[PDB]
Amino acid sequence: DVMWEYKWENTGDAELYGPFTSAQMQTWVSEGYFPDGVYCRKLDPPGGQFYNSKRIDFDLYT
Known part of the structure; x- marks a missing residue:
């Protein structure tokens, strides 16, 4: 149950x-x-170093 998240922008305030x-x-x-891709990230465990959805692998988690 790998949960993720995505941020439209790349700011520290962006929703x-x-x-x-x-x-x-x-x-x-x-x-x-x-x-144009989004700031994809994993909820748990929470860390940092965001990664563009177009640069992430969606074939090594589920």
Whole structure:
């Protein structure tokens, strides 16, 4: 149950969302909701060093 998140912008104030299953992330990303990519990140464990959805691997978690 790898949970993730996505931030439209790359600021320290930008609103953060995407607290859905890694699967739900692939949908939005694959669907086209993020044509320019988003600041994808994992909820737990929380850390840092964001990564563009277009630079993350959605075939090594679920």
